[PDB]
Amino acid sequence: GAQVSRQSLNYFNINYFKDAASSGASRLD
Amino acid sequence: GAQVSRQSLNYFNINYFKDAASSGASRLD
Amino acid sequence: GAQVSRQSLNYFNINYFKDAASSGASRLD
Amino acid sequence: NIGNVSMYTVTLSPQTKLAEEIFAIKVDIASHPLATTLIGEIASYFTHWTGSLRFSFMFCGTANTTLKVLLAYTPPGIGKPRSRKEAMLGTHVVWDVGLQSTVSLVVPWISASQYRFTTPDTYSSAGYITCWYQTNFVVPPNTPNTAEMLCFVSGCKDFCLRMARDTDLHKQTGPITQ
Amino acid sequence: NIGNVSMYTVTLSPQTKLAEEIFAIKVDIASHPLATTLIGEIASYFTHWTGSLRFSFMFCGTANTTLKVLLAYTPPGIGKPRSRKEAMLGTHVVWDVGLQSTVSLVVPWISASQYRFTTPDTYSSAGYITCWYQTNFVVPPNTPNTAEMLCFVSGCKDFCLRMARDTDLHKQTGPITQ
Amino acid sequence: SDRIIQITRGDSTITSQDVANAVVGYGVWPHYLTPQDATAIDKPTQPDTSSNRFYTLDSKMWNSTSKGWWWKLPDALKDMGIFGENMFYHFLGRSGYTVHVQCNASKFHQGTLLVVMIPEHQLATVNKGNVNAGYKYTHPGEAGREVGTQVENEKQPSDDNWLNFDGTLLGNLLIFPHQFINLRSNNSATLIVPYVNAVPMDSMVRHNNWSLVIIPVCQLQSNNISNIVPITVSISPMCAEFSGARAKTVVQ
Amino acid sequence: SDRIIQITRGDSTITSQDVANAVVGYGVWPHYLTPQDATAIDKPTQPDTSSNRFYTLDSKMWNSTSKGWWWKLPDALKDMGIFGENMFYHFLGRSGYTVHVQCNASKFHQGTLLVVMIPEHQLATVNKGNVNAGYKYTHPGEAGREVGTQVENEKQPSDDNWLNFDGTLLGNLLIFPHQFINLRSNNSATLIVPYVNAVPMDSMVRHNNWSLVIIPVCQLQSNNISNIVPITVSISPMCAEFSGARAKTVVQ
Amino acid sequence: NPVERYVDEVLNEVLVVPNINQSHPTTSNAAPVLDAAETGHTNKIQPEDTIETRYVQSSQTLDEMSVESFLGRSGCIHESVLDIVDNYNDQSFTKWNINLQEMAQIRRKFEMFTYARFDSEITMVPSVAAKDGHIGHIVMQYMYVPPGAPIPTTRDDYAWQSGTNASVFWQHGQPFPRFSLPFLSIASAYYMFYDGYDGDTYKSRYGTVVTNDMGTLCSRIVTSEQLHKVKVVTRIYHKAKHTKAWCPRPPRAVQYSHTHTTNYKLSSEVHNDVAIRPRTNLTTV
Amino acid sequence: NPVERYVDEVLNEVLVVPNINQSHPTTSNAAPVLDAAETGHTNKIQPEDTIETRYVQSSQTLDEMSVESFLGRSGCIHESVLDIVDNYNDQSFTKWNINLQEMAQIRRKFEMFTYARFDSEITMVPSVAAKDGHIGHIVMQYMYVPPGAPIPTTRDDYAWQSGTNASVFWQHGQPFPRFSLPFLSIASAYYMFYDGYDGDTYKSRYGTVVTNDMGTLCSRIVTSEQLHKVKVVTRIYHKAKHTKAWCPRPPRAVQYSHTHTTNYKLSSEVHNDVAIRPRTNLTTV
Ligand SMILES: *[C@](*)(=O)[C][C][C][C][C][C][C][C][C][C][C][C][C]
Ligand SMILES: *[C@](*)(=O)[C][C][C][C][C][C][C][C][C][C][C][C][C]
Ligand SMILES: *[C@](*)(=O)[C][C][C][C][C][C][C][C][C][C][C][C][C]
Ligand SMILES: CCCCCCCCCCCC(=O)O
Ligand SMILES: CCCCCCCCCCCC(=O)O
């Protein structure tokens, strides 16, 4: 699961498992 | 976190953690 | 550090460390 | 007074000597008696603090009771003021009791370092806040000769805490059972 | 002289014999007495060095004291010069003392290898620097008959150190306690 | 509300919930000296917030027999922090002031104080020939003078409140910047005065520019006399600037 | 001429007809604190010419046996006019300095003084375990300290000039802003140093930012020893500003 | 831009505190310092309103004060002990009714809110004490038994088959086990406090015990009986992830005494029961 | 170009030293060799000014001399000892007030600067000595306790719950633990030296002890009491990352005696106290 951004400064927000509970700490706001 | 350059000789300056203190030795200048 | 070629048969000549002494055996010629 | 609501009130009354001291406390966010206030408790879960503090006071005497009080903040590097004259050389507010019952004194962030330790530390002690009679407590006849005052505290727009740590304001000395 | 500021000064005086030797030291950056200078100390944190060295000398006698001195650098492969004639066959500067108190002698990088070991090594010994009277120390009457001279050292634009290592110029023989 | 006031000067903030407006002496707000009116040529020092702040003087007790009180400026502030230090280290000084007189009682008390700011209040002596008021007597400092208490001496100024301590009638003091603290209406008086003098700057040690005079014109009365009713004065210098720096002048 | 210098600060002007240029510590000229680096939020007071002027300390005598002298800043100026007053009335202070060391002799005298400005010169004690230099000893004021005169006490700092009073070698002091007064060439040294600290402003009472160290590296010699050769130091604060006004701190 | 936002994450500058602006002297009939606490509101006066401030650029951030940060740290919630003394069959397995009420440290933090919703990260730290010298080959089984599923009554109970329940097997020497648990409540949020009962009689239960049943954690040493006895202590650490919290409340002022209840005990000298240090008088700082 | 810059990183040729240019004989009234050290400046004379040089292309680089390189090497700063002798409860845990002043090697390098700012990489090397033969299963807990947080007084103290503090659990056999710490000061940089006090009285503390409080590191053997006693020594290594340093100073010339102070001891024969080797005379090389 990969949220690829580009700016080049590419960001890869990878989610390795198939359940939302598995992801790390949440972003803010 | 990936700074992808291209020249092809592509450079991948990956930052595996979300805190600046976590990255390796600094570049120079 | 990645030398990406294309032919598709893509070649990835990755250099995992920041010092030249760290890379494997040299190419020939 | 501990264990009684009276531990939250300061009593005022007609004075016979002028410029008497009413109370004096340290400004350090996690020092006593500030420690158990909500802001003091949250500050105790962090190692560093910065910003200005807002201290408010609500007069609870009769509508016919008058009073003028001087609230002062003494920056560090000196002892607590021994007199009203000494105290007013610092940051202060002269409170006139009237229709509006509450006044606020802001303790500005005046520090050498950008942050201070929440735990008592000599280098980072923030100073003192003292209260003195400016004029006097005055009442008409047939009116109670003493009155209470409530004191509040909260953080200004620039208050900020840093470096999470476990609190020393609560402990567990044994197992918590069913 | 160790433990005294006098360990930093060289005394000059009127000579009765011509072309006398004043001082002689090795040019090796981490050898004594160069070892404790800032450049010697930093060099001791590295294994290899290269580049030219700049040695300066400031005369501290009276404004009425005159002197001409010959400063020489003897490249390796030979012993230290036994006379002024021997020494001047090498790299040298004839210093005339006057309005400007300081002179600089540059020890050029003259080596077989691109780098030399900072630690004393026969193969990489850099040579010597000697000082001799060119003329003589001369003063008018009623003027002190001796004068001091200060000696400095720093690296030229091409000085460079390599291969970080722990220094042998400082030790710990026991625990450092509170 | 027109009854409320908040005055902030430097690190001090004063409030009153029962005011009677404010008076700006002669309609001129204090300001720094301009190059057109200046005479001393050295660059002036302007401490700003460290000097232009409220300094509270010693409180006084108002009772049925009080005759009045007076303070002289800058004398009353000679010992007040940075302002005080500057006035002694420099030959010349210049300053305006915000005077805030405080006096609260109750809705069952009555009394009236006439608060006046007098420029060049040159005091007189009574029945002492051409002997004038002694320096010591016109320089009481923050304690000021309590009229009708001082044991007479030859150089002792007049204590006749009805003659303004200078040979003029009390009723006419209203020609000077003033306010009244009438207990039924207000609990404070506020006067902002500019620098007034025939010279642009002056010695703050030997020349008192303004005199604050407080005279109870209507006697303090109530049915609860045991409750002390104090009068407190807080003064804030404004646009204070000094010139001619040297060692510190020590008086006496 | 490159041998001449005139330095004007406030109401003071200093001259020297035999200088060896001037040193600006770390290449940074003193300047006021910017809002980007500030932390204390109250408006700072900036006395300007009344504080940023030359203050001459007590002169010292240089003789054949002198071991050296040192002064600490701002401590050396704690009793100097308006600058001194401001440092005690305020919790925080910030300042740069122009240091002008003076020493004239003759063309028949010889001697050399090493003049150094050291940031955070944390003094050591010798053979006294973990007992550190006492507050009193590191705060000698304008008199400074004459090395090798003080009768030892437990809290007495090191007097070893060759070890920089801190365990480092004298020859390496040149890494700090410095000049030499070599009698044959110059009669003064001038160093301009900016404010150096890990915090934007600090307590001037408990933290000495800079230390002025003067060590005679080449002994004073001449054939007219009866003529006393003094060393005089004049220091001028630059961009002095203070914050956190209150009553005056009294030390001891 | 998700990349600018990314940089803010790395630098921890997502939530910046405002600057202090320069202020000036004032003489006004508007008195911001005066207000009425009776209203129940906090006077929003700032430093620029009471003193003459200078302009200061703030560089402080509130990221670390976020609820995610506050509750997003792994703390111990249970210490499971399997001490083989004299009967392997009876002493090699155990169970624990799961809750976040037994350890004061994390309990107090969660209780500063009335309701909270979050996913849970559980990390286990097992330590095998060699009571007799050797530990052999220790393999552990941790089974999550939801309410209603059969609880094993012996070390060889058929329930250990874990045909449906989630079991985590750990082998000594391998890294610490860890897994995530989705928000488990039947409600929209967990009740940190509950002023209610499971009925309307004198014997009805009161408090969070009525609403917060998360099942049982059953542990067992999988390895059969060994010659040398061991004492296996497994510490369970819990971290909240993707957290939301509602209605803040006063922090616990006295020691906790029991799970699922606000009950407390008071001594004859109450000042010893609270963190408040007695003052000598009103003027002694 | 970040790729050309990249190649320079790999080859370590980011900072090149200048070439030596060919020079010729001169006869001038400009004498670069003459100057005045009194000015406090270093004469910038180069080899081309004093001798006839040839042209030489320099290939040396200053990369390794950078402050990042100099201070970017992991050195030991502490050796923590947990020696089980006769009381497991008392001897299985300890604490250390963190500082970089106890080991001369890294202390001296950092002290060549007045102020320094950097992030820290901490690597721990635990070694379990089997005093009685077997080590069992050793699990360690290293808790970072910031100033103010409660310090554990027993091996089972509630503080070990680490509900908020950062704890690192290590299991014997697993790789060496390692973590990074952001710049921790309340100031803009760490004070390597501090000519100040925490007050203005004769009893005020002097030096960096006043400004450099980084908290306490509390260690504990998590494993319960085992039959065989062990001695666990954990060596802490520190490396500075993303370093900045200000105001260079002379290197420590004598042995250190205590933490946070420049105090030293001198013998009757001072030449033995410094690295200076006595010369026979001025002309003996
Ligand atoms: C997301 O939902 C799937 C996660 C997949 C995990 C594997 C990530 C590494 C991908 C490497 C691919 C390289 C591209 C050529
Ligand atoms: C940066 O902020 C995120 C770091 C993500 C770490 C994973 C790096 C491997 C990415 C492989 C993707 C392959 C592309 C197809
Ligand atoms: C080269 O100098 C940097 C080496 C980086 C090592 C990481 C290589 C894996 C990259 C995976 C990226 C996937 C692309 C989406
Ligand atoms: C199996 C390991 C433990 C899982 C704990 C997650 C459940 C959190 C619910 C908290 C409710 C309460 O404790 O009152
Ligand atoms: C917990 C492991 C140790 C962390 C050390 C990082 C702190 C560096 C601060 C140095 C200050 C000093 O030692 O005086």
Short mmCIF file of C-alpha atoms in Angstrom, two decimals, chain I residues 123-223:
data_model
loop_
_atom_site.label_atom_id
_atom_site.label_comp_id
_atom_site.label_asym_id
_atom_site.label_seq_id
_atom_site.Cartn_x
_atom_site.Cartn_y
_atom_site.Cartn_z
CA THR I 123 24.55 2.05 20.95
CA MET I 124 24.74 -0.37 23.87
CA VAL I 125 27.00 -3.39 24.18
CA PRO I 126 25.83 -5.70 27.00
CA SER I 127 28.00 -8.67 27.99
CA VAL I 128 26.76 -11.31 30.41
CA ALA I 129 29.49 -13.04 32.41
CA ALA I 130 28.45 -16.48 33.67
CA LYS I 131 29.94 -16.36 37.17
CA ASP I 132 28.43 -19.72 38.15
CA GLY I 133 28.29 -21.38 34.74
CA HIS I 134 24.92 -20.71 33.11
CA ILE I 135 23.34 -17.41 32.04
CA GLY I 136 19.75 -18.56 31.54
CA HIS I 137 17.56 -16.10 29.61
CA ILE I 138 18.75 -12.52 30.14
CA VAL I 139 16.35 -9.71 29.22
CA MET I 140 17.42 -6.14 30.04
CA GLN I 141 15.44 -2.91 30.38
CA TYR I 142 17.09 0.49 29.86
CA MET I 143 14.81 3.37 30.78
CA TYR I 144 15.55 6.99 29.98
CA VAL I 145 14.28 9.08 32.89
CA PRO I 146 14.12 12.83 32.11
CA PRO I 147 14.72 15.20 35.05
CA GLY I 148 11.62 15.22 37.23
CA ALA I 149 10.26 11.79 36.33
CA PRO I 150 10.21 9.34 39.28
CA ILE I 151 13.40 7.29 39.71
CA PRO I 152 12.84 3.61 40.59
CA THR I 153 14.03 2.68 44.08
CA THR I 154 13.50 -1.09 43.74
CA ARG I 155 13.60 -3.63 40.90
CA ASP I 156 9.79 -3.82 40.94
CA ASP I 157 9.11 -0.10 41.33
CA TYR I 158 6.00 1.11 39.47
CA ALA I 159 8.26 3.52 37.53
CA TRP I 160 9.45 0.54 35.46
CA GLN I 161 5.97 0.49 33.86
CA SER I 162 7.38 3.14 31.50
CA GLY I 163 3.92 4.47 30.73
CA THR I 164 5.51 7.57 29.21
CA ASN I 165 9.32 7.28 29.44
CA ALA I 166 11.21 5.59 26.64
CA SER I 167 12.46 2.12 27.55
CA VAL I 168 14.55 -0.22 25.42
CA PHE I 169 14.23 -3.94 26.07
CA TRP I 170 17.06 -6.17 24.92
CA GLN I 171 17.10 -9.93 24.82
CA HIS I 172 20.39 -11.78 25.05
CA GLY I 173 21.43 -13.13 21.66
CA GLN I 174 19.73 -10.32 19.74
CA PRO I 175 21.76 -7.55 18.07
CA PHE I 176 23.10 -4.60 20.07
CA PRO I 177 20.39 -2.04 20.91
CA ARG I 178 20.59 1.42 19.33
CA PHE I 179 18.47 4.57 19.22
CA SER I 180 18.80 8.26 18.43
CA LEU I 181 18.15 11.23 20.71
CA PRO I 182 17.32 14.72 19.37
CA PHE I 183 19.28 17.74 20.61
CA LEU I 184 18.00 17.79 24.24
CA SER I 185 19.10 21.24 25.61
CA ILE I 186 16.68 24.00 26.70
CA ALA I 187 19.24 26.34 25.15
CA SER I 188 20.32 26.63 21.49
CA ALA I 189 23.51 24.65 22.08
CA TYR I 190 25.18 22.55 24.75
CA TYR I 191 27.69 24.39 26.93
CA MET I 192 31.06 22.62 26.84
CA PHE I 193 32.26 25.33 29.26
CA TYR I 194 30.27 27.69 31.45
CA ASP I 195 31.82 30.56 33.41
CA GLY I 196 28.70 30.94 35.51
CA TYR I 197 26.79 29.95 38.65
CA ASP I 198 23.25 28.93 39.57
CA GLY I 199 23.12 31.83 42.01
CA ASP I 200 25.13 34.66 43.52
CA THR I 201 26.24 33.31 46.92
CA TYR I 202 29.41 31.65 48.21
CA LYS I 203 27.64 28.30 48.02
CA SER I 204 26.45 28.58 44.42
CA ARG I 205 27.53 25.82 42.03
CA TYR I 206 29.97 26.71 39.25
CA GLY I 207 30.35 25.29 35.77
CA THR I 208 28.47 23.03 33.39
CA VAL I 209 26.76 21.10 36.20
CA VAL I 210 24.43 24.11 36.36
CA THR I 211 23.40 23.89 32.71
CA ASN I 212 23.96 20.30 31.57
CA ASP I 213 21.37 18.07 33.28
CA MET I 214 20.30 15.34 30.83
CA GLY I 215 18.47 13.10 33.29
CA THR I 216 19.14 9.53 34.40
CA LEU I 217 19.53 6.15 32.68
CA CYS I 218 17.99 3.41 34.82
CA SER I 219 18.86 -0.22 34.06
CA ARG I 220 17.42 -3.47 35.32
CA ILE I 221 17.62 -7.17 34.61
CA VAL I 222 14.02 -7.95 33.72
CA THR I 223 14.49 -11.69 34.25
#
